[PDB]
Ligand binder design. Structure first.
Ligand code: FES
Length: 106
């Protein structure tokens, strides 16, 4: 299923991501270096911060309490569409989801 990662400079990278893989796992394993994923995906670090495109923000499962506690500490601007992408699990229904990657994670 297609996921489009748009870097801060505007370059769009479309990856095909298998069911059940987090957007963070697909990013880090494919050289999307602007997503760090330091804690390994347990919503313990805030370094997989992305901005979910408005056409998909309400299409993905809501942020649980742990993700909310960690989003508080993102280093780039926190926005209404900020999410930790290790919390976004790919499904066929999300095909085409676009996320914009901030210019910093640390
Ligand atoms: S990889 Fe650590 S919060 Fe997402």
């Amino acid at each position: 299923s297609k996921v489009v990662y748009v870097s801060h400079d505007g370059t769009r990278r479309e990856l095909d991501v298998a069911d059940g893989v987090s957007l963070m796992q697909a990013a880090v394993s494919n050289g999307i270096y602007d997503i760090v994923g330091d804690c390994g995906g347990s919503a313990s670090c805030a370094t997989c911060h992305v901005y979910v495109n408005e056409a998909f923000t309400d299409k993905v499962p809501a942020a649980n309490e742990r993700e909310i506690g960690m989003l508080e500490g993102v280093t780039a601007e926190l926005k209404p569409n900020s999410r930790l992408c290790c919390q976004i699990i790919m499904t066929p229904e999300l095909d085409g989801i676009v996320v914009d990657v901030p210019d910093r994670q640390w």
